[PDB]
Write a protein that binds this DNA or RNA. Sequence first.
RNA 1: GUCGUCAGCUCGUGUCGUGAGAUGUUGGGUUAAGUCCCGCAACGAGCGCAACCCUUUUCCUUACUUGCCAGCAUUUCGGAU
Length: 225
Amino acid sequence: YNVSMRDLLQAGAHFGHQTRFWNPKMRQYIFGARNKIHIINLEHTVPALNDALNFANQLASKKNKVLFVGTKRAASNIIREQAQRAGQPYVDHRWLGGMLTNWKTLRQSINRLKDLQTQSQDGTFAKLTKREALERTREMEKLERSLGGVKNMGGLPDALFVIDVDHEAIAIKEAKNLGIPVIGIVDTNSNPDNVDYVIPGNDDAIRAVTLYASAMADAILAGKE
RNA sequence: GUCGUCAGCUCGUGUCGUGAGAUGUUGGGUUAAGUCCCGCAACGAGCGCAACCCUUUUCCUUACUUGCCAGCAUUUCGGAU
């Protein structure tokens, strides 16, 4: 399930942000700048990506869970489709504060979320009139978009995967607080300090996020033990 | 009584701070209204608001006296009978 290197170049993982927005911690990985924007070498990208795939494969073999996290407008549908394909839940929309550090309250949220979904499946929602029914339906989309991923979880995920560390810094802080390992793609302008498995590459490119999510979903599915 | 029928006042778990504390109530529209919707390290609640109570406007059912008189009849022309 390795990504070779040529796939990374054809996707465009080497492109990064402008030199003026860089984070000095990525000096080792940047390797140079072709233009006023940084270009990261894939020679460092491929081994870390393969190691992340291996770790995810081992975790899936042990049947432990890897949560998906992508919120950017570019990678939202990518994490949508690939996490649905892999059967590993996700945080597609805005990362609500305290998901992991305040799980005791979110268990209740998942609770009447599931109860109202079961009511929608049942004929209970058929009895009441149209206005109140539409009110509860609006409540249903409102709750589902925020907590659609978390309903499957029965506990804290064993690992996290992150599309943008800066954009999902709150999730990184929560994972550091509770000790969950994090694998996230870290761009030029990003801080890799709290990421256990640092895979450096572009996160704006739809091709790049598609490649990353597809490869990780392939590894998770190919655990198969 | 008054501000004044003014629209605000409080609580839980998480985060931030050595700490007293803070967050949530924050911005853009709209409404009599913290009324509602989008935004938003916060998510959710409770009291306030609104509604439940009385009265008025249209119609239906029950009830036909001490109240009513469309049709019939008698009229002292007064539902008087």
